[PDB]
């Protein structure tokens, strides 16, 4: 297939001014200084930029690009987004599971995967892990081959590669470009940008496009560029690389001179004639949920910090709290101990839930690439990642804390009281985690979200009801208490512990209190905190946490729905 | 001056195997793959590596390197350590203030600075800022020139540069090496490493040294290397860069074969002959503290986040606390409010002091370079940085919090009570900050220190005396309370507030309490927390904070004293 671009202009302010050319089966290179057109032309040709700025026309075999083009062509990112804790077989299987039709038997998909994994020369690493911070594995050259194979699953007629060797050593980079030249002889059209290639690479190209400051400096067959610039009036010595000599001419050893010469040059008139001659979801929501969740689960298991470390810290902190508060009493210190331990337990669920900021932020480049490439809906992605990562890692620490502390402290020895604590600790973890996803979703860095989360919890924790008595606050601040996640958790836990407790030994204060100030039963403590003694006074806190979950998970979804992909 | 090296070997496991060569007035380049000897030879030649491994001999004009050599020669780092918020004039003035003799008048130092700043062609930027995150300034080419000028202050006979063109665009990299060739014609010996030079750079070299896997592979005049490798049996085509062709030969288009050829080659025998024709503080502590403190203060004023932002956050949080706790009462809620507000104030001084981790960590590369270069003692550096950065940024927020909250809350209306709160809030800030410097000093990353600091404060804050009554804890944990910084602050504040308060309106309770359990005066509250009612019960907490300051600032100093510089 031949890809032809006519009178391309693009504006954000122009960045591509007017560009004309054709690209053909073979190996086609786009070169120039980094701030020039080189990357933006690749992303216009690939339909990776926003159509609002594009002012020219792009055709395939003389017919317009379909809106479907992003699904029928391959595009390989500069820095590889491949799963470092899956194996090479599993990464190709996830691509095949979602880019191939639902018609095909698993053997008919493995025939596609086997043709691909053999053609790329990955046979010795097919079952090796792709390498992670905690896992030594497959090398950077094989990591680049793996990323190319995820696009070859669909037999794309056109491959786009962003900067494919700008990150690899020269003795790897030649093997990657020799692999690409063998692929081009299969009839695939390969279009790519590069940074300062060696002479050893430049000899391989079937076409060259050269761009500076959004002006075209050359387009034609690649080996003619040296003769063109020596004819235009420059000089190359012996022992010097043409690909550096071109960028040297652009840098003045002015771009208006170089643009005007090309408009007058033979290679333009031949290109202009050719362009006037040429101008004559795949899959259900359920299957996407299933495979997104599956990949996300293998990733959770392939990492110590996201799983084992948080479980170990939970068990250790549970036993430390269990030792300090061992054997709670019914005396003058018993209220202070029960108030303080339940306040530690809820605020610890909030600050340990700040790690949820990292859920979408680390995946952002992979999500945007896979979403533009049509792997899945935003709905099945967002649900498949909640269901796989967030759900189990917030059940477990809530169950563990309750089983360890409860019978060490000697909290109320009733079955429903134990399960109401366990359910209340779990609701405050999902609520705090949902607020983290609402702050974090669509952002590119962990640090600003982590700060904003931390600042929110210290203000919410003032309005918790331990540090200030909420019945005393002035009416014009008092409504701020309804916005606090720690308060609904702490109120539900205090209701559940204190009802029917006594704290004045030798004094039956149940029917009367003989001196007014003594505070001898847990009902007197609860009403003095402004808590409601009815069963609705317990459950009102859980409906509030369920609402904060639903609102924040909607804000997190709408943030991914209206994020800018291009 | 000529620098010569004979039979150099180095081990950590060998990394330099056996190396011989001479370097002379002119421009001398060290080349090869990144994991090879190239950087380690430069740091052996420069005396920037630990002498424990060095097994050969290095010799200047036929005499040994003196221990003084690090002070008499220039060394320029790969990534520039220059002060991005000082100006070019000020950066050169700080180098001149410490590397030149104390004998010289300020005009005799400005004559040195003016000769240097003119010779580097910096005249249009002498009074421009060197560029920071919040401050647009001098470009990367003139930023590299500024770093070279900080070494030229001493008129060094030898300059070493690690990777001087790496990280600069090709026109800037030429301008830097054209500047260096003009400097070499002044009779200075310039020795440097490069990552793969363009042909148009390689033509400039007066000598070439080529290294791979800790073997020497060429040493001679630079233009002879192509003829040597074409004689040894390789082939260079037209249109190809020799400097890439050498690294291609080293990559096998084996290193033992190429090392054996060099041992037999004419250029070895000629080098070996000459190596047998050969071989047959500046300033007081006070001045260093004065100038270190001065640089550090200009840097604090040149940044928004390190100063203005923490003051604004302090004033806002002070007024928010002042509104929530407005007008404290002498009723059943008055103990809870006074306990909770004083606990917020001390724990906020701990967590806001976690930012002290960043003090030495961000300066680490600059400190090690300047210390090896003999700018200052570790004593005058460490004191000059405490005195300048840490001291004012821990007084101010403590004074501001006290002036805002005290009369909004209506804490005890006595002059000494107000100053004892202000002094107690200030001691807990210096103590928490000193613990941060003890954890952080000598580490290279903020994140691990920040986590360890945060984990320490949540365990210290359990033992604070609000959340658990310290009189109830089992004897085998109870001694852990003495290790906690928040507890000494909170105990001193509670002592100062609660003495002589009453909390049961309409009851007098100074001589008796009509019913026990009632808790009607601040002495009953203090003794029920296990606090001592004597004046030593107040002051014991401040001697404890002063001891934690002295211990942690010693651990921070001994960490910089026994850090590995090489």
């Amino acid at each position, epitope marked *: 297939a031949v890809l032809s671009f006519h009178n391309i202009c693009y504006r954000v302010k122009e960045i591509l001014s007017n560009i004309n050319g054709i690209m053909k089966p073979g190996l086609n290179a786009i070169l120039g200084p980094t701030g020039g057109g080189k990357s933006s032309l690749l992303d216009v040709l690939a339909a990776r930029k926003d159509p609002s700025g594009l002012s020219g026309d792009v055709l395939i075999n003389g017919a317009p690009r379909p809106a479907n083009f992003k699904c029928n062509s391959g595009y390989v990112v500069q820095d590889d987004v491949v799963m470092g804790t899956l194996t090479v077989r599993e990464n190709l299987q996830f691509s095949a599971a979602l880019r191939l039709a639902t018609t095909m038997t698993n053997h008919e998909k493995n025939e596609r995967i086997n043709r691909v994994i053999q053609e790329l020369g990955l046979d010795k690493v097919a079952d090796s892990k792709v390498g992670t911070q905690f896992i030594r594995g497959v090398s950077g050259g094989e990591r680049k081959r793996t990323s190319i194979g995820m696009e070859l699953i669909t037999d794309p007629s056109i491959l786009f590669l962003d900067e494919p060797t700008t990150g690899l050593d020269s003795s790897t980079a030649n093997a990657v470009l020799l692999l690409l030249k063998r692929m081009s002889k299969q009839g695939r059209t390969i279009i790519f940008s590069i940074h300062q290639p060696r002479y050893s690479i430049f000899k391989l190209f079937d076409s060259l496009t050269l761009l500076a400051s959004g002006r075209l400096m050359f387009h034609g067959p690649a080996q003619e560029a040296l003769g063109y610039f020596e004819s235009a009036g420059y000089h190359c010595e012996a022992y010097n690389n043409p690909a550096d000599f071109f960028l040297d001419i652009i840098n003045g050893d002015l771009i208006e001179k170089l643009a005007e010469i090309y408009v007058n040059s033979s290679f333009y008139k031949e290109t202009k004639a050719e362009l006037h001659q040429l101008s004559g979801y795949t899959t259900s929501f359920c299957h996407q949920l299933r495979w997104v969740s599956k990949r996300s689960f293998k990733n959770l298991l392939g990492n110590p910090q996201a799983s084992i470390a948080q479980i170990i810290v939970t068990v250790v902190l549970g036993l430390v709290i269990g030792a300090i508060y061992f054997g709670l009493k019914n005396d003058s210190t018993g209220i202070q101990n029960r108030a303080g331990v339940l306040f530690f337990l809820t605020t610890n669920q909030c600050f340990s839930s700040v790690s949820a900021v990292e859920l979408f932020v680390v995946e952002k480049k992979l999500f945007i690439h896979e979403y533009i490439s049509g792997y899945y809906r935003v709905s099945s992605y967002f649900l498949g990642k909640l269901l796989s990562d967030l759900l189990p890692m917030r059940m477990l620490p809530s169950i563990i804390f309750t089983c360890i502390v409860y019978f060490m402290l000697g909290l109320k020895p009733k079955a429903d009281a134990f399960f109401v604590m366990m359910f209340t600790l779990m609701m405050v973890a999902y609520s705090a985690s949902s607020m983290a996803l609402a702050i974090a979703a669509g952002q590119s860095v962990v640090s600003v979200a982590t700060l904003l989360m931390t600042i929110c919890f210290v203000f919410m924790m003032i309005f918790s009801g331990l540090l200030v008595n909420l019945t005393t606050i002035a009416s014009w601040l008092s409504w701020l208490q309804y916005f606090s996640i720690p308060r609904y958790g702490f109120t539900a836990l205090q209701h559940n512990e204190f009802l029917g407790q006594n704290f004045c030994p030798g004094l039956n204060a149940t029917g009367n*209190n003989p001196c007014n100030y003594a505070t001898c039963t847990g*009902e*007197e403590y609860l009403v003095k905190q402004g808590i409601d003694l009815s069963p609705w006074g317990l459950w009102k806190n859980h409906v509030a946490l369920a609402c904060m979950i639903v609102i924040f998970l909607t804000i997190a979804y709408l943030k991914l729905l209206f994020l800018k992909k291009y | 001056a000529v620098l010569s090296f004979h039979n150099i070997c180095y081990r950590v496991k060998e990394i330099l195997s056996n190396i011989n060569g001479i370097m002379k007035p002119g421009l001398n380049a060290i080349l090869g793959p990144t994991g090879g000897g190239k950087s380690s030879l430069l740091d052996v030649l420069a005396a920037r590596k630990d002498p424990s491994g060095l097994s050969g001999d290095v010799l200047i004009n036929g005499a040994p390197r003196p221990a003084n050599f690090k002070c008499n020669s220039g060394y320029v780092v790969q990534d520039d350590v220059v002060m991005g918020t000082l100006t070019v004039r000020e950066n050169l003035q700080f180098s001149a203030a410490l590397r030149l003799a104390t004998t010289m008048t300020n005009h005799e130092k400005n004559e040195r600075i003016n000769r240097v700043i003119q010779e580097l062609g910096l005249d249009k930027v002498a009074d421009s800022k060197v560029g920071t995150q919040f401050i647009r300034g001098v470009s990367g080419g003139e930023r590299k020139r500024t770093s070279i000028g900080m070494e030229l202050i001493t008129d060094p006979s030898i300059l070493f540069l690690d990777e001087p063109t790496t990280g600069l665009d090709s026109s800037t990299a030429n301008a830097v090496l054209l500047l260096l060739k003009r400097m070499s014609k002044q009779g200075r010996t310039i020795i440097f490493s490069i990552h793969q030079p363009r042909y148009s750079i390689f033509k400039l070299f007066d000598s070439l040294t080529l290294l791979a896997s800790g073997r020497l592979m060429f040493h001679g005049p630079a233009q002879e290397a192509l003829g040597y490798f074409e004689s040894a049996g390789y082939h260079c085509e037209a249109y190809n860069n020799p400097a890439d062709f050498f690294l291609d030969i080293i990559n096998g288009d084996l290193i033992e074969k190429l090392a054996e050829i060099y041992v037999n080659s004419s250029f070895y025998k000629e080098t070996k002959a000459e190596l047998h024709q050969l071989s047959g503080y500046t300033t007081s502590f006070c001045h260093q503290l004065r100038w270190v403190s001065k640089r550090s203060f200009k840097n604090l004023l040149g940044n928004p986040q390190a100063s203005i932002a923490q003051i604004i956050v302090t004033v806002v949080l002070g007024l928010v606390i002042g509104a929530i706790y407005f007008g404290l009462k002498n009723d059943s809620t008055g103990i809870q409010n006074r306990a909770g507000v004083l606990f917020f104030l001390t724990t906020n001084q701990c967590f806001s002091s976690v930012s002290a981790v960043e003090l030495f960590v961000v300066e680490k590369k600059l400190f090690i370079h300047e210390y090896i270069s003999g700018y200052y003692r570790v004593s005058s550096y460490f004191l000059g940085k405490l005195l300048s950065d840490l001291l004012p940024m821990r007084m101010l927020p403590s004074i501001i919090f006290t002036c805002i909250v005290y009369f909004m809350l209506g804490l005890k209306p006595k002059a000494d009570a107000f100053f004892v709160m202000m002094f107690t809030l200030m001691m807990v800030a210096y103590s928490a900050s000193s613990m941060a410097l003890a954890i952080a000093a000598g580490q290279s990353v903020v994140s691990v220190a920040t986590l360890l600091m945060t984990i320490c404060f949540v365990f210290m804050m359990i033992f604070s005396g609000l959340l658990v009554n310290l009189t109830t804890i089992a004897s085998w944990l109870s001694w852990l309370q003495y290790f906690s910084i928040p507890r000494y602050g909170f105990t001193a504040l509670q002592h100062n507030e609660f003495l002589g308060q009453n909390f049961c*309106p*309409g009851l007098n309770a100074t001589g008796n309490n*009509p019913c026990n359990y009632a808790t009607c005066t601040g002495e009953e509250y203090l003794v029920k927390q296990g606090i001592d009612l004597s004046p030593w019960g107040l002051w014991k907490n401040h001697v404890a904070l002063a001891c934690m300051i002295v211990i942690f600032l010693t651990i921070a100093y001994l960490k910089l004293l026994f850090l590995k510089k090489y």
Partner: antibody
Amino acid sequence: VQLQESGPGLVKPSQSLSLTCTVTGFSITSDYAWNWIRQFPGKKLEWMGYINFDGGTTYNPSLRGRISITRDTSKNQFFLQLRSVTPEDTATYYCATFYGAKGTLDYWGQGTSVTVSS
Amino acid sequence: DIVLTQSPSSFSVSLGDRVTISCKASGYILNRLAWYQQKPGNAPRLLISGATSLETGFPSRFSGTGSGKDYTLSISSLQTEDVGTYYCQQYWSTPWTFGGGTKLEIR
């Protein structure tokens, strides 16, 4: 123990009302809190405020900025002073003692009427 | 604040009969409830102090039997000395509040 109100029984709109209470048989700086309570024409009771044995004081929010209570420990007196008085709050004014540990108004004066009119 | 309701403004009862006066709080009061008897031309006199305890100098014919938010004052075998106005008062929250008062009148 023993309480007695006194003061002007008749006052102008926008003027200030002022009642003394004198205590005997006990000392106002010893133990209790000391109250003012008013009873309206068409009987309902409003509690107005107190001064405590230590001289601290507290008021009903219905009287915001209008009321203060003060004392003379030389002679066991305390005083109701109520500014910007209005014909809507003619009442019978009582001083009373709040016992603290028991929580109740155990001792009352006989109370004094106040008339406010144009 | 907390408001007290006494449901009837006035009764009508014979000598020697039984009578029962109801006081409803808006918030929980945890027995911090007192009852006052007022004869015409006199200060209110305390009768019950804490919802179930009776003052020395009143007959055991009176007793109070409340809990939670609902409180009540009982007289069994009332007598001619008992005729008057009765108020409940809460003393839980710092703005102390009386009920609207209820009157006993002979029949």
